[PDB]
Amino acid sequence: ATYLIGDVHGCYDELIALLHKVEFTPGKDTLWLTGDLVARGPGSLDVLRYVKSLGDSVRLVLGNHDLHLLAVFAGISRNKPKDRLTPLLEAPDADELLNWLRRQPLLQIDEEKKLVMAHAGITPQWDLQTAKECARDVEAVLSSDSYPFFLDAMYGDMPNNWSPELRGLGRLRFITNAFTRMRFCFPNGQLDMYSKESPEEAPAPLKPWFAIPGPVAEEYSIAFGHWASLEGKGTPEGIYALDTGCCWGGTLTCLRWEDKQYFVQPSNR
Ligand SMILES: [Mn+2]
Ligand SMILES: [Mn+2]
Numbered sequence: 642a643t644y645l646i647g648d649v650h651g652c653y654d655e656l657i658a659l660l661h662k663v664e665f666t667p668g669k670d671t672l673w674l675t676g677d678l679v680a681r682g683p684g685s686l687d688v689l690r691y692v693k694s695l696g697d698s699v700r701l702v703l704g705n706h707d708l709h710l711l712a713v714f715a716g717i718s719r720n721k722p723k724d725r726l727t728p729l730l731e732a733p734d735a736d737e738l739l740n741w742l743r744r745q746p747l748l749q750i751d752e753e754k755k756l757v758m759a760h761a762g763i764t765p766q767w768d769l770q771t772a773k774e775c776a777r778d779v780e781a782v783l784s785s786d787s788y789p790f791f792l793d794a795m796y797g798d799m800p801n802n803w804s805p806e807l808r809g810l811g812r813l814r815f816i817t818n819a820f821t822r823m824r825f826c827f828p829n830g831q832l833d834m835y836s837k838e839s840p841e842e843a844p845a846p847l848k849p850w851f852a853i854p855g856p857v858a859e860e861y862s863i864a865f866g867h868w869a870s871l872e873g874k875g876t877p878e879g880i881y882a883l884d885t886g887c888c889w890g891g892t893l894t895c896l897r898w899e900d901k902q903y904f905v906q907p908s909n910r
Contacts, residue, residue, distance in 0.1 A: 647882075667696075679706055690738065702745070757769075757861045761824070762823055765850060824850065
């Protein structure tokens with residue numbers, strides 16, 4: 642069976658309880674995770690140890706908190722107490738866990754399931770070939786010996802409009818923002834990097850990225866996490882918003898792909 646779970650955010654107990662509810666069995670089943678494995682919840686260290694141990698039984702995409710953890714580890718960014726990352730950063734296997742984490746994808750594609758995953762979704766300004774190339778380019782910098790320079794460069798809110806002509810720092814920043822921070826778009830597909838509200842709470846003319854017809858969404862189902870204020874609701878056919886806010890006191894959601902059946906684990910608080 643194939644299971645897809647939204648942002649875990651260090652909620653190790655809820656993750657394991659949900660996997661036991663569906664009797665997840667590595668070697669028979671595959672787990673897809675929308676990223677943001679770490680921060681806010683208490684068990685980021687246990688989450689990373691477990692997800693790394695799954696090997697080929699898990700298909701991960703990196704989220705914005707996963708990249709932020711890497712930036713803290715590399716001395717690029719300051720550790721925020723609220724993120725609760727210190728046990729992971731101080732662990733004796735921190736190097737092993739985080740060198741594994743930075744090698745993971747930003748984008749997963751299964752052609753037989755006609756299924757795409759990324760943390761925030763797929764901007765409507767990208768076709769599939771472009772999304773693949775952009776994921777490959779950022780994955781290459783993150784997996785390289787020089788990844789702290791990219792982590793430092795990734796911070797920024799501009800440019801917010803895609804063009805194949807983008808080069809350099811702006812190209813990489815846009816790619817990172819589209820895969821890991823996107824929520825709202827302007828009508829022309831341009832990213833808005835400020836509003837984090839629900840679609841009904843947002844100011845005009847902002848619309849969800851998935852409300853703008855895009856070439857990927859026209860041919861593939863898209864699963865994503867990230868947008869907790871969406872509460873997993875309000876999406877069109879073929880768009881699966883899996884982040885129901887476990888770390889915020891919401892729920893952890895798991896979708897089984899074969900029958901589109903949902904399983905939910907309440908937050909422990
Ligand atoms: Mn998140
Ligand atoms: Mn996120």
